[PDB]
Amino acid sequence: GELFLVGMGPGDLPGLTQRAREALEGAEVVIGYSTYVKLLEEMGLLAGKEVVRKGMTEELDRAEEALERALSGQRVALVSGGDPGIYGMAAPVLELMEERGLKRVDGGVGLPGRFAGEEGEVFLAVIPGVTAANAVASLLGSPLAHDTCLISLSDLLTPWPLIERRLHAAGQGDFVVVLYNPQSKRRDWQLRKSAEILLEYRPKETPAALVKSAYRKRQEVALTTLEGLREAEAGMLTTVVIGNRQSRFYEGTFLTPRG
Amino acid sequence: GELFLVGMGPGDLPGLTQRAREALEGAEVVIGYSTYVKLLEEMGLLAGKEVVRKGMTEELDRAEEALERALSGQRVALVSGGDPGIYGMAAPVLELMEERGLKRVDGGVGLPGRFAGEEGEVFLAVIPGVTAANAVASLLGSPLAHDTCLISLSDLLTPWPLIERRLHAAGQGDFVVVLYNPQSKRRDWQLRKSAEILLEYRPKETPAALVKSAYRKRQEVALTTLEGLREAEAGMLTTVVIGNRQSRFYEGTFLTPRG
Ligand SMILES: Nc1ncnc2c1ncn2[C@@H]1O[C@H](CSCC[C@H](N)C(=O)O)[C@@H](O)[C@H]1O
Ligand SMILES: Nc1ncnc2c1ncn2[C@@H]1O[C@H](CSCC[C@H](N)C(=O)O)[C@@H](O)[C@H]1O
Numbered sequence: 197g198e199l200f201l202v203g204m205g206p207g208d209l210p211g212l213t214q215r216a217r218e219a220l221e222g223a224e225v226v227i228g229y230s231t232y233v234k235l236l237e238e239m240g241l242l243a244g245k246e247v248v249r250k251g252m253t254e255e256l257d258r259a260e261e262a263l264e265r266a267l268s269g270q271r272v273a274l275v276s277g278g279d280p281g282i283y284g285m286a287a288p289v290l291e292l293m294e295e296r297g298l299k300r301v302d303g304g305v306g307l308p309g310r311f312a313g314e315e316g317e318v319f320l321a322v323i324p325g326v327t328a329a330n331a332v333a334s335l336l337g338s339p340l341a342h343d344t345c346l347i348s349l350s351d352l353l354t355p356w357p358l359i360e361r362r363l364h365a366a367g368q369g370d371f372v373v374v375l376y377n378p379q380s381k382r383r384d385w386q387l388r389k390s391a392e393i394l395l396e397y398r399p400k401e402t403p404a405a406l407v408k409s410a411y412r413k414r415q416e417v418a419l420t421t422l423e424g425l426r427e428a429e430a431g432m433l434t435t436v437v438i439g440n441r442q443s444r445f446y447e448g449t450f451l452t453p454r455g
Numbered sequence: 456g457e458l459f460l461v462g463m464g465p466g467d468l469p470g471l472t473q474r475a476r477e478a479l480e481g482a483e484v485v486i487g488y489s490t491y492v493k494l495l496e497e498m499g500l501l502a503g504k505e506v507v508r509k510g511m512t513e514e515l516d517r518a519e520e521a522l523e524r525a526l527s528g529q530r531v532a533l534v535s536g537g538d539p540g541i542y543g544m545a546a547p548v549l550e551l552m553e554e555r556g557l558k559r560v561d562g563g564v565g566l567p568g569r570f571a572g573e574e575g576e577v578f579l580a581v582i583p584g585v586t587a588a589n590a591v592a593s594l595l596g597s598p599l600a601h602d603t604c605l606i607s608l609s610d611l612l613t614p615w616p617l618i619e620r621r622l623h624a625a626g627q628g629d630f631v632v633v634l635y636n637p638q639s640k641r642r643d644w645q646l647r648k649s650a651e652i653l654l655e656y657r658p659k660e661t662p663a664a665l666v667k668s669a670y671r672k673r674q675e676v677a678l679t680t681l682e683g684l685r686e687a688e689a690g691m692l693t694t695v696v697i698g699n700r701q702s703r704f705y706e707g708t709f710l711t712p713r714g
Binding site for chain 2: 203205206208209210211212213214215217218255279280281282283284286287288289290291293294298299300304305306307309311321322323324325326327330331333334335336337338339340341342343344345346347348352353354358361362364365366368369370371405407417418419446447448449450451452453454455
């Protein structure tokens, strides 16, 4: 069958690419974490299709469900907010296929591609989407106009010491920093820690911003400084952006020099 | 008037977001580097609109042209391949507005926003788009599934020593690396140099790939290794991706572990 990993962008109907719309239109079943599925349902894009959201809390379960359905011949659309390849479903799906020993049967490289196994075969494709970094950047100004690093503060499957390594490196390289999964009830110290690490490489007054629910209901853009992040409150719907040693504010906009 | 920086994605019609389509539909005049403008013209999206491509070779000229037209009351669409905020027109435009001393007149933060000056006023908005990183990643597998750094190898407005600093940092932090503007007739040594720097942090057999004209005519996906990049030939239509110490190839796909 087919397994299309559909990146839906920041969350609003106009935010999806036509390629994403078409992938959803041609899908028989749609799988994804509850929040994404509901957004699509609200848009009226899931009408007359099988929708799986129950028991789809875990990433591994979503991937296994989508893969097994695809292998059984179904036309599946597995949705990820933003882009599937950025802290999304692309990795879990490929790692699962790898674990099951599915082999490529079309001689191609990269994706899309046809893979097969004793269970059956699957045509896998990834539909790219506007990732959080660019989506929030468009609501800020030109914060990512130069070299940038994308870092997730989720230490669920990644040891914190490795994340600190990533942060120190971003600091020394003078990279604009975009923090994905900046904070949660459990993970309430990671953001502050990240700010303290970067503060060893750039000024306290360095531009920073917290953009919540970009392109969605209750969207919020909060401008602050790197020092301000030490006490800032972020959520799972927030993306944080930290400027480099050249970033500055310009009439309400977050400007990172192109040169 | 209006100045909409429209990110058109990788280059194919289905690759644009609906928001981008709508911004183009509502524009009276469209400005952009020749190649992007031609792609849109081919798509049939510039019919009945004023199209400026002549003399639009330089980024500064494109920005000034778009800004002055907007200030004169025109509804302008300035196009950038991928996303305007990633080595695109967002920075040049804001820096120019800053230089002219345009002031914000709506009390808002970030963008969109209304700015004004003795010359007139302009409503500025950035329409995000799928940037090269995610677009090529979708044609590779899950290469960016973990922390990633975006680096441009264009040393036109950025001293090479700073780029080397960025590269060494990406290496030590064990970041997946995406190289924008990897090579040109003039800049034919930067890619090799970049590979040699990263080779000090990760194995020669580390997965790497060169993706040319993603989603366009003559699209090409070439898989290789970090060592292979030392002699690889890239162009201005190519994006290079270098895996981290955990990246591996899986049945033709470029897989970077999510955890
Ligand atoms: N609309 C939105 N506004 C702000 N941040 C968002 C967002 N959508 C996703 N994110 C960011 O991404 C995190 C989830 S991780 C999944 C990210 C997704 N694949 C992408 O490409 O964006 C969130 O915790 C947040 O930091
Ligand atoms: N269709 C495509 N395929 C491969 N690389 C592309 C591409 N479009 C843009 N790029 C990459 O981007 C460079 C131009 S820099 C402008 C990038 C653009 N704003 C974006 O967001 O992608 C190219 O030299 C190349 O490295």
